Design a protein around this ligand. Structure first.
Ligand code: COB
Ligand code: COB
Ligand SMILES: CN1c2c(nc(N)[nH]c2=O)NC[C@@H]1CNc1ccc(C(=O)N[C@@H](CCC(=O)O)C(=O)O)cc1
Ligand SMILES: CN1c2c(nc(N)[nH]c2=O)NC[C@@H]1CNc1ccc(C(=O)N[C@@H](CCC(=O)O)C(=O)O)cc1
Ligand code: SF4
Ligand code: SF4
Ligand SMILES: [Ca+2]
Ligand SMILES: [Ca+2]
Lengths: 323, 441, 262, 262, 441
């Protein structure tokens, strides 16, 4: 009789990407964060090692965000000061990373100068001691000028520059190599493009341990399952020896969740949905929670309480369930 | 669909040929192929019984939670991942309630439970059952609780009482319906099995770990009852995911007949917010029926949303209704944007325009829920098709000034679409994200 | 799809001369180019000419692993030479070959378990190569049962239905495919399958066309490994493409390159 | 293997413009260029571009059989357009295509028996293309039951499991092979099958390599007909070689030439 | 294995889902696959026996003629063409002797029938049975006739008489070796089947056409007698070739259980030479038992030779005994030719040498019956192997020289060989056809 624990042995594992660098490593950060290294399905300790837990990065912009009034409330005291904004996310809210989303670099909007964007990055580096994840605004020509200058000045800090798509990865990849930085590979919900993108970036002689996958996740109730399946298929392939899918998975759960009506719409407007306070918190929390079971290593969040409740989830999921 | 080795390994290995086949090993070949029946060989007994049962049966059995249109189906699954094949039966949601509570608070909470149904994305989310637990001192408080709730709500039920005598006395007036019997234990399974037997109700099976669960299940099954739901006794979410996976794995990948039944999960997180997130990990990891304690609309919405998404067939695309969708103010002086009914495409556009801040009409042409470019290639998106959708709206009367905006990706259509629809076609940006720029210009 | 390099065979000229005078250069070089082609395994054959099969086998092993970490496939009917080669294997190896003969099974199956290596089993006996797929499946069932009998990992058993030239033995090719497709009903988990691909186009016109065509046809039936020419670039592309068409690897535009540099 | 030329389709630039201006010259040329390639059948589709189908379908039928005698295949969804083409068909016909829905079955099934033509049946329904092969077989079995119902010879029934690109829907390719493999076993005499081979490599790098590879894999599972590009010489060779490896046609040194000059 | 159509047709049309499957059609799919047992559907009784039979039963059943070592197995065939797979059971040749002939004329013929045994090319050919017909006016003559034959021969017997009552009295003594009761007709099948039932003997079935044959066979099956051999009534060879093909085709490709039995043919050609050729057609056209009226040893040897050739397995090659075959009256100065024991190869050589009238010694090296080139490629023709045969064969004692001729195709073998055998190896012409000119020079 007896009960035989079916343990699926993995042929390979997901890469280990080191974030940030200390004084001895030519950086100025307080500590370093390592992601990936999983040897099985997400939180399957009984059939593989999960050496490093997933981390959570909070979004910080060089300008004030256009986020709903509900989301702006917990940051009202430091929302217009990037240096003070980052310090609160780390000390008060206990973030693992600082997601420096430079929306102010947008030529149409704030139109911050190249010297201003690099000044904001350096400001955050002097504020907190955690590793940074700096991405552009979304303007190809502008980001090519911004991310290049940021990488050159913050060289040694081992930043994680963001978003290097299929048609546009040439300028960003070269910057990461010269100044020793990591890079994010973003794909429009396509594992085929995702795999092909990691090849082109690697073919430029950039190590595979310096790449992190952005599947362009969908928010809860907005095609989150399309990204959920992809993140799983990526996770399977990483264990099956596919080195091109061995990169850790990053998720922009903050942007995709708070752009939904169900996250910020008042209770008086939608009585059937309930109070918009905790409904918005859980909207970003469930989004992150579901993707954690898909293979999310770095979660880019916004709301404080949302981060706290997800951390509690991670705190319990890292408890070894090994038989 | 049965391996020849699995068949041969059960055979006496005599090689007598009384089956009409020289050896057992060759007879195993003929069984996998289907050359002869297994009833021919007069030898063996329990070997032939298990073989027929294992070969011709699903990995996860099906146990219905009651009768009527309100009844839901649990178990019956063949996959570990949703991308391999669609997940069939959504997670059964049940809100728990204690019996030692006052009647006024009981009815007030039950009344709130009946309102736990939401409307979003043109979809309807609903719960399934209510868990009545026994925490009082008097066994007469439990029967006064279940009968009270069953008089207010019409949803399914799940009875939670240790002593079968206390349970049956509370079950008798509700045994004709659903109420799941929670739970059978290695000390009182005998009485519990008999109650679920005569009353024809599903029987929950409790166990301390994987081992005690498997040992108890076989005993209950041997008594004749096969309508069971499994409980590995996992109280922690990490211990849950591990145990919940094994039941799903061993039944599918190993044909373990002890774990060939759905799983009932119990939330243990004190904080209602932590419980919801803990419930997300359950509805994702092969749990069939979860029991919640928090009954807030603020909490049940994100849970029931993820449950719907996960259990959607990856084949069929999520689609919205082919009916003009008013954005913001409208007022008869607004932009009209043409798009398709694919839910993903529609909301990409809906989302972008809410952003624009200009009240807009959005016409999602019925393309069977396909993204316009895919529908385009199908030819589903045609000048004839889009023109006809303009008419059903009878929009031109609706808008004082006639125009419509086409997705930039099918810019080619605009002359032909313009000429037979009689509407000025402006070709918009290829990505809905540039809608704001178009509004500016 | 596992590609086993067939070039290192004593039947070839340059290989035979290299064994006679113990010249590592041709043997080591071919081990490189076959690996350059995309082969993850190398089949070593001493040939009919050499009188000392045992020592020549050990030589081939000791000089091949010096410049290759690929899985060595010991190609010899002599059991003594097979075991001797396994004693010199730096890494995991493959045994070629064993038949359904009980006298060979009890000697080669435990030998595979002892060294923890793979085992290639021919669906035949002393009579010869069968034709009907129902006959090939009979010897195959014994091999599967023999694997479980001696406690051998089922995925380490490479069943070979044996392939014959498509000109003089054309009626074998459709039977081999029917053997591969019906092999799945022998075990759970099911054993693996291997073929000596180049044999199907013996004395035929345009061999590479016949080789890669049959390889794709065999993979659809469930071919896991194949002993063919790893220097045929058109053959490697076929193995890569057919691997994608079976959903065994996530597609990308550079899927062929991901196969060669896997 | 019955190669059905696909080039005469309303999606192409030349064919589209040859319909609006009613120019027989390009249509006739492709009707001959595909024949030289090895296609013994031509697929006639009016495409979405043309406004009226009744006139366009009948116009294609005449000008195609004007300089050709190949078995014509009418490709449309419109019931009136299909029957309109069957009128002017002086040679053999082949209706394409139909699904398992009775509204489509009641209309096209007796229409095929009336002219004594072949009927290409899709394994899909109103909702969309099935994922698992078990559902493809379910719609196939209904097409077989409806074949014995309306009194149609099984060798005229061409089951179409459908094929999707190996990039967006790679997980369909192995299911199609499983479908084809089990199609011959679900009915005796076994129904014929047909695929839109060129669809598997849509938006994929090196389309021809993927096309001919899947063809060999499909024929190995039992594929009778295939709607692909006849002007692809590499595709014809694989289609020819696969017949030898399936022992369908007696081998000869010039087996490729004989298939091209069938 | 059966078909999806075969199941659905036999299946009713209720669509009641009692089997666990929605519709009856979808249940047929689960049967052809093996997802569920067919016993779930309570409908019908013969269909359960029809499906069990058709799926399990071979195309043609096996009925044995005789008992013990002298028993011959008829039927049991699965092929139309011998190149698809080998024909299994050879034709049962039988000789007919009329009863009206006097006791001395009845003994002299059977004496010659026993002498119908032949030895050719290293193989032995024999007949199987003797046919005793009834042309006499009195019924009692048949009992004296069968008794006269019973003591004379030990071969199988087949009795031919219309009346069962006349047949049973003569069957009494010889009913121990299971005779063939010819034949069953629709007018007397009731008494014929009953008689063949008690003695458990193969019952021949006659019918005027395939229709009357199939109808009558079914009548006998219902009585409980399956040991039947079919007679379509075709007396003409063109009619027989057509009819026998149908019996053979319908039983194999259509599962026609009425024709799933071996066939018995009757040579009707008046001329003895015309009869043998008519028998050649029958033994080629699926006939399991042909009755001849010719007892000449000239008329049986070629007929039995063709029967031997036709029923040879193509997959399994014919082999010549390894040894030395002296061509003519070979002296101690004559040549020695090395070749293989593949019969085709050896007689190619034996034919050329005898044809040129060259007395010689031929050494067919055992190569498991493989041709010289293949033996060479399969390492089966090493210089070592040939050298060993030179010593093995005892050819040295035979000749005063030490010279051997190698097939030109393995010309190198000869040079290698000379050294380890101690014989002078001459390389001959690549084709045995050039042997005459090689020996002349
Ligand atoms: C949001 C949506 C994402 N796009 C998608 O989700 C589709 C992605 C994808 C891979 C295509 C390639 C790619 N990934 O880039 C490929 N398919 Co598809 C293989 N397909 C599918 C998927 C359909 C999924 C669905 N529900 O639509 C299937 C596998 C079933 C599929 C099938 C087909 N597909 C087909 C084809 C050809 C294509 N398919 C495409 C779209 C593509 C580009 C692939 C190719 N390259 O060849 C083909 C179409 C281009 C062409 N004709 O050349 C086809 C015909 C293949 C075949 N022969 O079978 C077949 C359709 C018929 C059939 N079913 O048999 C897929 C997934 C795709 O984009 P969207 O364009 O709808 O919206 C988008 C939005 C967001 O940016 O803003 C814009 N926008 C949208 N609406 C509006 C606006 C903007 C403004 C201003 C408005 C006012 C309105 C803009 O248009
Ligand atoms: C009479 C006989 C007919 N020849 C034959 O009947 C053989 C024909 C044929 C097609 C070969 C090609 C061809 N058709 O030309 C091919 N096979 Co074959 C694929 N084979 C077979 C057939 C066996 C038939 C048999 N029972 O022997 C099989 C399909 C099983 C077969 C198998 C093999 N075969 C193999 C091979 C390689 C060959 N096979 C050959 C012989 C050939 C030539 C094919 C080719 N290549 O072009 C190969 C050998 C040449 C070489 N090494 O290059 C092999 C090894 C394939 C493989 N990769 O394994 C495999 C053997 C091992 C194994 N079984 O696994 C066949 C049918 C052939 O010729 P023969 O040479 O024996 O006698 C002949 C005779 C009549 O002219 O006169 C001469 N002669 C004979 N005895 C004497 C003399 C003359 C003199 C003067 C004497 C004193 C004596 C002369 O030698
Ligand atoms: N076969 C085989 C096997 N092993 C297994 N398990 N199964 C097999 O069928 N090992 C040996 C062989 C496969 N390897 C080979 C090796 C060479 C050739 C081949 O075609 N060689 C050339 C010789 C060229 C030269 O000598 O220059 C030839 O034409 O025969 C074919 C298959
Ligand atoms: N398909 C199909 C079918 N019929 C059935 N039963 N099943 C099918 O899958 N008939 C139509 C089509 C098969 N024919 C075709 C036609 C064109 C292309 C093709 O690849 N066309 C080019 C377009 C070139 C241009 O626009 O100039 C392409 O790249 O898509 C493929 C298959
Ligand atoms: S009758 Fe039973 S025990 Fe005997 S050989 Fe057949 S299967 Fe084996
Ligand atoms: S039980 Fe029989 S009659 Fe009823 S649905 Fe099933 S197959 Fe049809
Ligand atoms: Ca396989
Ligand atoms: Ca076929």
């Amino acid at each position: 009789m007896a009960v035989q624990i079916l343990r699926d042995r993995s042929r390979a594992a997901v890469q280990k990407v080191v974030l940030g660098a200390t004084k001895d490593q030519g950086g100025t950060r307080s500590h370093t964060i390592v992601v990936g290294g999983d040897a099985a399905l997400p939180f399957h300790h009984f059939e593989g090692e999960i050496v490093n837990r997933p981390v959570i990065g909070m979004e910080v912009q060089d300008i004030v965000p256009d986020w709903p009034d509900v989301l702006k409330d917990p940051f009202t005291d430091v929302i217009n000061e990037p240096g003070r904004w980052a310090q609160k996310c780390v000390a008060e809210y206990g973030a693992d990373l600082i997601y420096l989303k430079l929306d102010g670099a947008d030529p149409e909007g704030a139109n911050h100068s190249v010297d201003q964007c690099v000044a904001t990055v350096k400001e955050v580096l002097q504020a907190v001691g955690v590793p940074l994840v700096v991405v552009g605004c979304g303007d190809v020509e502008k980001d090519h000028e911004v991310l290049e200058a940021v990488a050159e000045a913050a060289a040694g800090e081992n930043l994680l520059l963001g978003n290097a798509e299929q048609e546009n990865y040439k300028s960003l990849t070269a910057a990461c190599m010269v100044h020793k930085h990591n890079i994010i590979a973003r794909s429009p919900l396509d594992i085929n493009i995702c795999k092909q993108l990691n090849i082109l970036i690697n073919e430029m002689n950039l190590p595979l341990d310096h790449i992190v996958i952005d599947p362009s996740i969908g928010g809860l109730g907005y095609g989150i399952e399309y990204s959920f399946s992809i993140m799983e298929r990526i996770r399977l392939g990483a264990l099956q020896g596919d080195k091109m899918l061995s990169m850790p998975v990053i998720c922009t759960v903050g942007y995709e969740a708070w752009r939904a009506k169900e996250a910020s719409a008042p209770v008086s407007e939608y009585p059937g949905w309930g109070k918009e306070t905790e409904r918005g918190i859980l909207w970003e929390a469930v989004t992150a929670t579901a993707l954690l079971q898909a293979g999310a290593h770095i979660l880019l969040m916004r709301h404080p309480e949302a981060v706290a409740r997800v951390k509690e989830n991670i705190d319990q999921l890292m408890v070894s369930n090994a038989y | 669909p049965l391996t020849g080795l699995e068949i041969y390994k059960q055979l006496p290995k005599k090689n007598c040929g009384e089956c009409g086949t020289p050896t057992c090993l060759a007879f195993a070949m003929n069984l996998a192929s289907g050359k002869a029946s297994l009833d021919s060989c007069p030898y063996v007994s329990d070997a032939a019984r298990e073989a027929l049962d294992a070969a011709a049966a699903p990995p996860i059995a099906k146990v219905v939670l009651g009768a009527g249109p309100t009844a839901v189906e649990m178990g019956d699954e063949t996959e570990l991942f949703r991308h391999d094949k669609r997940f069939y039966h959504e997670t059964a949601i049940a809100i728990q309630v204690s019996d030692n509570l006052s009647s006024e608070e009981l009815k007030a909470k039950v009344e709130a439970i009946n309102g736990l149904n939401f409307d979003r994305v043109g979809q309807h989310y609903t719960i399934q059952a209510i868990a009545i637990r026994h925490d009082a001192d008097d066994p007469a408080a439990f029967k006064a609780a279940v009968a009270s709730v069953a008089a207010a709500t019409q949803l399914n039920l799940v009875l939670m009482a240790d002593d079968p005598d206390v349970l049956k006395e509370a079950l008798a007036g509700v045994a004709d319906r659903k109420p799941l019997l929670y739970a059978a234990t290695g000390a009182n399974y005998e009485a519990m099995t008999a109650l679920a037997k005569e009353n024809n109700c599903p029987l929950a099976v409790y166990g301390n770990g994987l081992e005690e669960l498997a040992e108890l299940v076989d005993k209950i099954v041997a008594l004749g009852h096969k309508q069971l739901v499994l409980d590995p006794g996992a109280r922690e979410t990490s211990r849950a995911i591990a145990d919940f996976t094994q039941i799903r794995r061993l039944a599918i990948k190993k044909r373990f007949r002890s774990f060939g039944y759905p799983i009932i999960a119990l939330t243990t997180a004190a904080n209602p917010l932590d419980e919801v997130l803990q419930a997300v990990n359950y509805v994702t990891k092969y749990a069939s029926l979860v029991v919640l304690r928090t009954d807030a609309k603020e909490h049940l919405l994100p849970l029931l949303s993820w449950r719907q998404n996960l259990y959607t067939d990856p084949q069929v695309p999520i689609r919205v209704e082919e009916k003009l969708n008013e954005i913001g103010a409208v007022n008869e002086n607004s932009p009209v944007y043409v798009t398709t009914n694919f839910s993903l495409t529609y909301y990409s556009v809906e989302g972008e325009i809410e952003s624009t801040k200009i009240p807009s009409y959005l016409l999602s042409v019925d393309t069977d829920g396909l993204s316009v470019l895919t529908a385009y290639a199908d030819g589903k998106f045609e000048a004839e098709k889009i023109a006809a959708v303009m008419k059903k709206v009878d929009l031109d009367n609706k808008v004082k000034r006639h125009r419509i905006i086409i997705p930039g990706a099918v810019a080619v259509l605009k002359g032909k679409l313009e000429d037979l629809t009689g509407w000025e076609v402006i070709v918009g940006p290829r990505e809905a994200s540039g809608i704001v720029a178009f509004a500016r210009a | 799809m596992l590609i086993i390099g067939e070039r290192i065979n004593g039947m070839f000229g340059d290989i035979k001369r290299a064994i006679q005078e113990r010249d590592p250069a041709p043997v080591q070089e071919w081990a490189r180019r076959q690996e350059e082609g995309g082969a993850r395994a190398l089949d070593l054959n001493v040939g009919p000419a050499v009188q000392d099969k045992v020592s020549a086998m050990e030589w081939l092993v000791e000089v091949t692993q010096e410049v290759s970490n690929l899985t060595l496939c010991l190609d010899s009917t002599n059991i003594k030479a097979i075991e001797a080669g396994l004693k010199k294997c730096k890494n995991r190896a493959m045994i070629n070959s064993t038949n359904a003969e009980r006298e060979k099974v009890e000697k080669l199956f435990p030998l595979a378990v002892e060294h923890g290596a793979a085992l290639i089993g021919l669906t035949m006996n002393k009579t010869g190569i069968p034709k009907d797929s129902d006959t090939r499946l009979a010897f195959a069932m014994e091999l599967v049962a023999a694997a479980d009998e001696f406690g051998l990992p089922m995925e380490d058993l490479y069943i070979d239905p044996l392939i014959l030239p498509a000109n003089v033995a054309q009626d074998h090719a459709p039977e081999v495919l029917k053997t591969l497709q019906q092999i799945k009903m022998l075990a759970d988990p099911a054993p693996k399958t291997v073929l000596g691909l180049s044999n199907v186009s013996q004395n035929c016109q345009n061999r590479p066309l016949i080789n890669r065509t049959f390889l794709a046809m065999a993979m659809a039936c469930g071919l896991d490994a194949a002993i063919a020419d790893a220097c045929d670039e058109a053959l490697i592309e076929t193995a890569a493409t057919a691997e994608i068409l079976l959903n065994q690897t996530v597609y990308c535009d550079s899927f062929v390159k991901m196969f060669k540099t896997r």
